[PDB]
Amino acid sequence: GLLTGDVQLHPEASCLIMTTEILRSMLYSGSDVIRDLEWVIFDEVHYINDVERG
RNA sequence: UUUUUUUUUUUUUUUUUUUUUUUUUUCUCCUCUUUUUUUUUUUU
Numbered sequence: 001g002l003l004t005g006d007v008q009l010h011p012e013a014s015c016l017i018m019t020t021e022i023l024r025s026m027l028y029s030g031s032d033v034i035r036d037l038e039w040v041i042f043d044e045v046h047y048i049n050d051v052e053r054g
Numbered sequence: 055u056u057u058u059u060u061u062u063u064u065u066u067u068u069u070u071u072u073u074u075u076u077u078u079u080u081c082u083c084c085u086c087u088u089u090u091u092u093u094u095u096u097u098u
Contacts, residue, residue, distance in 0.1 A: 011062085026061080
C-alpha cells in the first residue's frame, strides 16, 4: 500500500509505505493498526537536524 | 537567484404476532255539551 499525499493505493495492504507525517497522523488517533505492527523502519534518520521538519 | 512535505466521502442486515357493528339516563301529564246510537229498500 502507498499512502503518499497525492497517490493512495490499497490502504489496507499488509505493507504500508508512507511519508513521515502520515505516521504521526495515524499515531494521534488509534486507527487500530498499531496493534498488528511488528516492524516499523525509518529510511532517512538524518532529518533530526532538519530546521523545519525535525 | 525563492527548494521539501502535510492519508480520506459510518460499519451492519436473511424480524415473530392467534381480532370484529355498537358502547352510557331525564318525571307525572282535565280531549267542552241535541241524543238514544242510525240501520229495510232500489238503481255502481
